[PDB]
Ligand binder design. Structure first.
Ligand SMILES: Cn1c(CNc2ccc(C(=N)N)cc2)nc2cc(C(=O)N(CCC(=O)O)c3ccccn3)ccc21
Lengths: 222, 219
């Protein structure tokens, strides 16, 4: 039951600050050091530092000193990573992680947090159904989906029937539109025989704009 | 700082065949307690890294027998005796013997499965998008191998240019295939000037190109 739950994606302005949280549960929070790892484009993975949850003691990677500040709240069992003097190089996925066997390994990780550094404004997505029809059938199967357009920044998450539909789902990486906004598609293959009895809803979440869109996808006569 | 040099950058292996990933530290990585804290992690796109090997050669709980680790001094190796579909993603070696802890550059493992032809699907624009004055047509290329596939958008048999965007998925962890989504976007005014909306697909698995089309006004 050990879980590391990170805060949603954020967009911040150049030179400003972002505070990423890591809520721990299923273990005694003060028993294990909390680590922060950065996954930046063309940079692979980088260990930023460790935090002793008992005393707030920290050990930073020199590269992240003065830039990053690690703290924790023992009352809510939440670790925090704050980044200051934000620049394009800080646009990355940030992970919190722990080791439950001394200094042997990182066995538990958070789901990651995408921090975007931009002066541009946050824009919620436009969700359109990709209706199944005779033109989206193949060997007893029917494809359907959702077209998620004109959002900013990344990411948007897509689930189907609130996570109950995962088999045959393909959620594609976003493409960048000429305007600077993003677009993605999410598809699924289902039996073509049960389009009359099954409800297919794509659940689109965009944390920067605090948007949640549930689009029901209905069949068409192509 | 300890520099961890991972080789090769990319690998393509047929299932049931062995794979070897090498890692090289710029200096020795013996911690003050005498242990070499050298670990291997697997990361799939969108997901967090997953532990495989630790202390050079110890296999973490639940990791299959096929994964083994070895090494001495500055040279360390991850070995997968028989590669499986589920092994896809980026492998990283990592050292925690000396502060700051450092990762290798990563090695992308690709599964070398049999040629699979894509299944082609087309989607008309929705009424809700048309209301805003735009019409996006989506062509889906599902479960194909190899990754190289060509989509050509044809409107009343006329080849389109500069009005489409496409994206390919990472390799599938169950069937070792790729999927491709292409979006043709034109104004409602241009959309209503034509009948046939077609995506022509070429792939090594198809003997001749496959056309999937719909007629505007039939949906
Ligand atoms: C530096 N460090 C780490 C780093 N973690 C780590 C995990 C994995 C990896 C890796 N991936 N190889 C690399 C590093 N864990 C530590 C645990 C102790 C410890 O002795 N105590 C008791 C100390 C007291 O209070 O007397 C302790 C226990 C919980 C909280 C605070 N202190 C000391 C030092 C530690």
């Amino acid at each position: 039951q050990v879980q590391l739950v990170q805060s949603g994606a954020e967009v911040k302005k150049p030179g400003a600050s972002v505070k990423v949280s890591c809520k721990a549960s299923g273990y005694t929070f003060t028993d294990y050091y909390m680590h922060w790892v950065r996954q930046a484009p063309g940079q692979g993975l980088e260990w930023m530092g460790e935090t002793n949850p008992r005393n707030g003691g920290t050990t930073y990677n020199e590269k992240f000193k003065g830039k990053a500040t690690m703290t924790r709240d023992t009352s809510t069992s939440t670790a925090y990573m704050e980044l200051s003097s934000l620049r394009s190089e800080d646009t990355a996925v940030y992970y919190c992680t722990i080791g439950t066997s001394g200094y042997d390994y990182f066995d538990y990780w958070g789901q990651g947090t995408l921090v975007t550094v931009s002066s541009a404004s946050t824009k919620g997505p436009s969700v359109f159904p990709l209706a199944p029809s005779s033109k989206s059938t193949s060997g007893g199967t029917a494809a359907l989906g959702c077209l998620v357009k004109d959002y900013f920044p990344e990411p948007v998450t897509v689930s189907w029937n609130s996570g109950a539909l995962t088999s045959g789902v393909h959620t594609f990486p976003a493409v960048l539109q000429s305007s600077g906004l993003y677009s993605l598609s999410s598809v699924v293959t289902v039996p073509s025989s049960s389009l009359g009895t099954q409800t297919y809803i794509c659940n689109v979440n965009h944390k920067p704009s605090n948007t949640k869109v549930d689009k029901k996808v209905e069949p068409k006569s192509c | 700082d300890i520099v961890m040099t991972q080789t090769p950058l990319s690998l393509s292996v047929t299932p049931g065949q062995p794979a070897s990933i090498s890692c090289r530290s710029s200096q020795s990585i013996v911690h003050s307690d005498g242990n070499i804290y050298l670990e291997w992690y697997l990361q799939k796109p969108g997901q967090s890294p997953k532990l495989l090997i630790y202390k050079v050669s110890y296999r973490f709980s639940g990791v299959p027998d096929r994964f083994s680790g070895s090494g001495s001094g500055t040279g360390f190796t991850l070995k997968i005796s028989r590669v499986e579909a589920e092994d896809v993603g980026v492998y990283y070696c990592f050292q925690a013997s000396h502060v700051p802890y450092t990762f290798g550059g990563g090695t992308k493992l690709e599964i070398k499965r049999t040629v699979a032809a894509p299944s082609v699907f087309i989607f008309p624009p929705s009424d809700e998008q048309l209301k805003s004055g735009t019409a996006s047509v989506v062509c889906l290329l599902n479960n194909f191998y190899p990754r190289e596939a060509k989509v050509q958008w044809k409107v009343d048999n006329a080849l389109q240019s500069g009005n489409s965007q496409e994206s390919v998925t990472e390799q599938d962890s169950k069937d070792s295939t790729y999927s491709l989504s292409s979006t043709l976007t034109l104004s409602k005014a241009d959309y209503e000037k034509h009948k046939v909306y077609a995506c022509e697909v070429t792939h090594q698995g198809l003997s001749s190109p496959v056309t999937k089309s719909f007629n505007r006004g039939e949906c």
